[PDB]
Symmetry: C3
Subunit: 362 residues, 3 copies
């Protein structure tokens, strides 16, 4: 295998766009939602934990997520990237670029959790939790889905991380919760998240090809359909649209199309978008509401991927010998496994912090 | 024709940059200019109409703008992108990428109009207007200039949309008008518009070649020359420069070089920049002032393209058998047609809304 | 030599990212630090001087920096880019793209100086200074390091501008000084600087290859290590971390890895990051503090490059026949020359302005 320079270029720029989603996208999103007296401390926590994830990833994270091992974890052969030649190729790009791209996914996943709970948790406690949950939840689930583990081996479909990123993070946020002063700032964060999400979704193709093109167009369409679905529902129930409603609808569509984007047709993208925007509004009606959107819209997206990948409905098609019924059962099992795995690990992380330093802010 | 992956990569990233111009560039620009009590509602209108344009484009917009038809419109053969194979090539890129790029141009054009008039117009009325004006003005003019229609057939020169985007939108804004509390926010929006404009101007080449390179350098030079021309004029007339003056000068140069950027030399870019910055200041002296800059600077740019494309002046050269006099007459005719076409359609759109829901805010 | 379109694409996008560092990155960074009554005037000065640098670069700047001449300056053969054919290739890209990329480096260097001193200096005086210092300091030092001049001829290692950008600007700021109201704004500027810095560091490879990949990964790692080093030091000395501390640590790592990024291993990047973050904190303890970070962290970075380029330590290796001792001596000499050259020229610029218009604000 030799590296293609067009693919090297595309994938480095997509990596920069995903890093932009955390620094400053998710920080500004939460910054406009929470109480003003809490903004400075939350911004500090997001920045410090981002740095921590970047370091853990290179020391051992990449090796245990993407090295060859078993169904649940990889190996320790790639510690500090040892034994990876600079000219080594993964797919059609230099392996060093694959390291950076996958690291940026771990960063945004952790940013989602830390932003929402920074108000309520002690600084030393959040650091302990991130170390436990990244090592024992993010890494294994990434291995299972994208690193040749249990879920991949059974043919699960998840293009850009409905399970790995969204459901994984949403469950961890909810467990923590159990244990808007500046709307122009919220809008600015939403917009930066949207633009960076093209790197997130299209970059998951690993090459500047027709599947990257499909994922790009589907991202535009599903986001737009979800803005419109949320806003219509808000007009019907509340009498009029709102700015926070429009931004929430955008996020709902982006989350919903995440697992599906490289597998479905544009018609499918429009239908997934509308359903996701409405499911999101239902979800928040029943800033920890962000875990309601990422969780509900993630499950909806993962199920609907097992429908709209069908050739009959404009998709790329299921694998050889796989019926729609079979794919649907596999999607359901992958969602169930992600929920229980993340839920158990988070509980352990929060409890270990509480025994060592105490959880609640002094 | 086979797709080139370097061109696929370049054009997907340029599309993301043009979407960044609307979400959040133009929204933050207007957000700092208008009254504070009106900011939230304007941001909501920009976001909802952006979603509407994205959907209309994929349902029928692309087909009637870029399909083969007559001098004024295309066809309905590409509804919801039916009959476009995923591997179909347009120029040197996948056709799906061309769909996304051209859609992003329709979005920024509509954002220019909606941002300025959101204070004054009822929500349901703006939705009606966008549907009428996009369908009957944006689409036909795009077909005429870039889709093999009337103006292209007569050899009109317009690299990135002096007519299609700027004059088209400026006239529609002026008809509506007939019928700064946060300057750091205005500066931030201006800066995001500038950075995204490299995707807008260089991406109009359709490939990562020497014409894309020329357009890039000309964008840097004309923007800088227009900042300096506006600021000098402000010092002469008002006694000193201002922040709003500097931002306005930047926009003036960007608008002026839009039709010319892929056809002229760097010397030509510097001259066009200076004249545009001064014409812009004259224009505002005689946030609906934004329609004064986009309109005056658009006309100036379109005329000056018919001069500075000449080989003698450092340009790429006129087509075979075309004198400078002939090109100039064709530029003038293209400007006249755009003004009357947009003016008539806008009047019809505003009037239909007024008869159905009433125009003015309740 | 023929141009590679993948490299053309990569280098145009990296240029847009470096322009983003000045407009609006450095402007927002300083905007949150200085007194509120001074913000508008500083933003105006940054914008006008940016335009001035763009014009001077194309008129004569590129020619005297990158044309063939002597050890200290180039020539006047490329005035207004005359005699450069549109299809001319430099390395593996069109020469017009090289012009734009190198111009963006001159812009950020000047932005660093103007942002910090805008409060204190008269407008007409800053314009005079920029003209003198760009022409007689930035241009010659760029020629010496990257244009085949004195320092390159002796084998100096400086991948992305520890001398040319950071030490050069830091000394000029300090000479001027001799002669935080909005922390969310400071965080936003820091984040935009970080994202743009991938274009700055990876783009310095000139191609989308394995050296660009190495520079990208090293940027992620050194920034993260420096955030952690600064924050630890702040906890030890001050009792707790702060938002301004975290942002300062990020900048320290970015500056430190600038000269080293394309030459060192990931282990080396982590060590350079930690040392830079701690040296930065020491430096500020002993907004002109920004010249303390860029100066101290620049020197540290330039020295440590002469160590960690060694094959033994995971680097790409020294040139044929060059020991670690020899490279270290050459690094020290390059730092000494940059300090004295910039220091002398700045003194002359500030003095000429003071004799013509007066330096201090009226």
């Amino acid at each position: 295998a030799v590296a293609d320079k067009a693919d090297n270029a595309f994938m480095m720029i997509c990596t920069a766009l995903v890093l932009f989603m955390t620094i400053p996208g998710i920080a500004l999103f939460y910054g406009g939602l929470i109480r003003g007296k809490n903004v400075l401390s939350m911004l500090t926590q997001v920045t410090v934990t981002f740095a921590l994830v970047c370091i853990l990833w290179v020391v051992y994270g990449y090796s245990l997520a993407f090295g060859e091992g078993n169904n649940f974890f990889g190996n320790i052969n790639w510690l500090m990237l040892k034994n990876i030649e600079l000219t080594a190729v993964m797919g059609s790009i230099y392996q060093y670029i694959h390291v950076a791209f996958q690291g940026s996914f771990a960063c945004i996943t952790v940013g989602l959790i830390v932003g929402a709970l920074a108000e309520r948790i002690r600084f030393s406690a959040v650091l302990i939790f991130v170390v436990v949950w990244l090592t024992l939840s993010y890494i294994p689930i990434a291995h299972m889905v994208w690193g040749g583990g249990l879920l991949a081996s059974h043919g699960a479909l998840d293009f850009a991380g409905g399970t790995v990123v969204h459901i994984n993070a949403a469950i961890a946020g909810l467990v923590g919760a159990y244990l808007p002063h500046n709307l122009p700032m919220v809008f600015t964060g939403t917009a930066i998240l949207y633009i960076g999400w093209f790197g997130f979704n299209a970059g998951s193709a690993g090459t500047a090809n027709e599947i990257a093109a499909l994922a790009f167009v589907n991202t535009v369409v599903a986001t737009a359909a979800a803005i419109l679905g949320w806003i219509f529902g808000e007009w019907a129930l509340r009498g009029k649209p709102s700015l926070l409603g429009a931004c929430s609808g955008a996020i709902a569509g982006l989350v919903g199309v995440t697992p599906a984007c490289g597998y479905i047709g544009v018609g499918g993208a429009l239908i997934i978008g509308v359903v996701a925007g409405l499911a999101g509004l239902w979800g928040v009606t029943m800033p920890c509401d962000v875990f309601g959107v990422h969780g509900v819209c993630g499950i909806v997206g993962c199920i609907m991927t097992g429908i709209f990948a069908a050739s009959s409905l404009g998709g790329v098609g299921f694998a050889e010998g796989v019926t729609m019924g079979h794919q649907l059962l596999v999607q359901l099992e992958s969602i169930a496994i992600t929920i229980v795995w993340s839920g158990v690990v988070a509980f352990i992380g929060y409890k270990l912090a509480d025994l060592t330093v105490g959880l609640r802010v002094p």
